[PDB]
Point group: C3
Chain length 67, copies 3
């Protein structure tokens, strides 16, 4: 039963090896996924910045026009 118990451990060890390598691959792909999302959020923030800045100029242009 020590042999059967060692045999069971080698079996579970093999499954743990396979799963750990699968998880490593997924974790690294997800890190890459997140990089793409962060890049897009940044790009969008820059775009919102540009809109806001131009709104400030528009408001001032309206003030100039009003006189």
């Amino acid at each position: 039963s020590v042999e059967d118990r060692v045999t069971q451990l080698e079996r579970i060890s093999n499954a743990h090896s396979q799963l750990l390598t699968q998880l490593q691959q997924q974790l690294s792909d997800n890190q890459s996924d997140i990089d793409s999302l962060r890049g897009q959020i940044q790009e969008n923030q820059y775009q919102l910045n540009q809109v806001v800045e131009r709104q400030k100029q528009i408001l001032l242009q309206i003030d100039s026009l009003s006189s």
Copy 2:
């Protein structure tokens, strides 16, 4: 020190690992879900932003006429 002590200890660690691996799979799934969700949220934000940029371009032509 007996082989029995050691397979005892290996069964203990193996079960710890089994538990940690489940926890890891559960939290990875959550994270991959969050990745998909944030992707959706970005896309909806980019679209609304596209529309604001375009409304500003329309505003800027009204201002030009008045200048």
Copy 3:
């Protein structure tokens, strides 16, 4: 090999798995932390966009007074 060798080998693999497990836990926490930070940021970009939308409506009314 003997039960004794098989055990020694399981012990080397079990140690390897503990190390990898610790590393994958850390990379999953990193991905979670990144997600929660980006969630915060997109919410803030949406909050600003909403303000920009209402400002465009106010700009239109002001442009209207000018003609």
